[PDB]
Amino acid sequence: SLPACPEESPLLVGPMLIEFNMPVDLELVAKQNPNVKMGGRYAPRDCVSPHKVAIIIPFRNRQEHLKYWLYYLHPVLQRQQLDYGIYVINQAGDTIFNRAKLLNVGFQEALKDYDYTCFVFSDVDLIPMNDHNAYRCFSQPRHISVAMDKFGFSLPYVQYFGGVSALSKQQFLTINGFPNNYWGWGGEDDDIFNRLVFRGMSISRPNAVVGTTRHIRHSRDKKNEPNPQRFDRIAHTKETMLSDGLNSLTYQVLDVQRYPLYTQITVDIGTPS
Ligand SMILES: CC(=O)N[C@H]1[C@H](O[C@H]2[C@@H](O)[C@@H](CO)O[C@@H](O[C@H]3[C@H](O)[C@@H](O)[C@H](O)O[C@@H]3CO)[C@@H]2O)O[C@H](CO)[C@@H](O)[C@@H]1O
Ligand SMILES: O=c1ccn([C@@H]2O[C@H](COP(=O)(O)OP(=O)(O)O)[C@@H](O)[C@H]2O)c(=O)[nH]1
Ligand SMILES: [Mn+2]
């Protein structure tokens, strides 16, 4: 009986003011966002969204950034009329970080919850400044964080595909998901760009005004040093993507916590092999 949501949401108010200098109380955010259900799940009451979106955040030791993320994104995702859930993929242990492997985990685990057909991969410290910037999937892979304050409100290079992005289930599968062996900082986003290009796709983007994005200024994380093998790795994506990714992934889930505003999956993704 519920009709389809309008194709573009009429609830959008456009540009927004974003500030990171006050404290955030998640209990309060939960009260300001009463329609968000346990585990950070929301679909609209009045219409059926065609967008079944799992939002996937790679994570370790960024609780403060995360509270800001939840405070800003949650009202925006409801105005966009999405059928969505938030997944924070928490890396167990204190060995070298692996951003892309955590993303793969999030894809695979979120599918166990619900028939998601769209995946948004979002770093924890990026907040969109304009709710016209749609956090859902298109017929090509979507790069969302296109105009970040830290790159002067434009793309750092035209093939940049870091920060926030959205792939439909079919696009993510078509590239065998993300690489598992980018350990430490950098390059895995370029590798993923390569993968899309090698499977016949191109990058869809909003314009630079709608795509405006703030990055929470923060200092360097321990245990995520620039990976010095990144430049070699990106040069060989075409060959490696064939057998590195979804089809070579294992991990061990240690703990699943359903909090009011998000599901946190704590996972042992191991160390380099
Ligand atoms: C592989 C990698 O590290 N990718 C990250 C990306 O780094 C690239 C980016 O900094 C661009 C321009 O900003 O420069 C790239 O290096 C080039 C240098 O410009 C140049 O001095 C050298 O001669 O050639 C290089 C290749 O043309 C650099 O690799 O930056 C983004 C955002 O910080 C990360 O998301 C990527 O992981
Ligand atoms: O110790 C870490 C390292 C990074 N990340 C996540 O990985 C993303 C990318 O790392 P980073 O912040 O270093 O990129 P930068 O903006 O500094 O270039 C972050 O936004 C977080 O989501 C994290 O949670 N803990
Ligand atoms: Mn950052």
Curated annotation (Swiss-Prot):
Top-level class of the enzyme under EC nomenclature: transferase
Post-translational modification: The soluble form derives from the membrane forms by proteolytic processing.
UniProt KW keywords: Cell membrane, Cell projection, Congenital disorder of glycosylation, Disease variant, Disulfide bond, Glycoprotein, Glycosyltransferase, Golgi apparatus, Lipid metabolism, Manganese, Membrane, Metal-binding, Secreted, Signal-anchor, Transferase, Transmembrane, Transmembrane helix
UniProt pathway: Protein modification; protein glycosylation
Effect of N227S: Protective factor against coronary artery disease; strongly correlated with low plasma LDL-cholesterol and fibrinogen levels; decreased UDP-galactosyltransferase activity
Catalysed reactions, semicolon-separated: D-glucose + UDP-alpha-D-galactose = lactose + UDP + H(+); an N-acetyl-beta-D-glucosaminyl derivative + UDP-alpha-D-galactose = a beta-D-galactosyl-(1->4)-N-acetyl-beta-D-glucosaminyl derivative + UDP + H(+); N-acetyl-D-glucosamine + UDP-alpha-D-galactose = beta-D-galactosyl-(1->4)-N-acetyl-D-glucosamine + UDP + H(+); a beta-D-GlcNAc-(1->3)-beta-D-Gal-(1->4)-beta-D-Glc-(1<->1)-Cer(d18:1(4E)) + UDP-alpha-D-galactose = a neolactoside nLc4Cer(d18:1(4E)) + UDP + H(+)
Residues engaged in binding N-acetyl-D-glucosamine: G187, E188, D189, D190, R230
A Gene Ontology biological process term: oligosaccharide biosynthetic process
Lumenal side: 1-273
Cellular component terms (Gene Ontology): azurophil granule membrane; basolateral plasma membrane; brush border membrane; desmosome; external side of plasma membrane; extracellular exosome; extracellular space; filopodium
Residues annotated for UDP-alpha-D-galactose binding in this entry: 58-62, 97-99, 124-125, 185, 218-221
Phenotypic consequence of W185G: Reduction in N-acetylglucosamine binding
Family, similarity comment: Belongs to the glycosyltransferase 7 family.
Protein name (record): Beta-1,4-galactosyltransferase 1
Organism: Homo sapiens
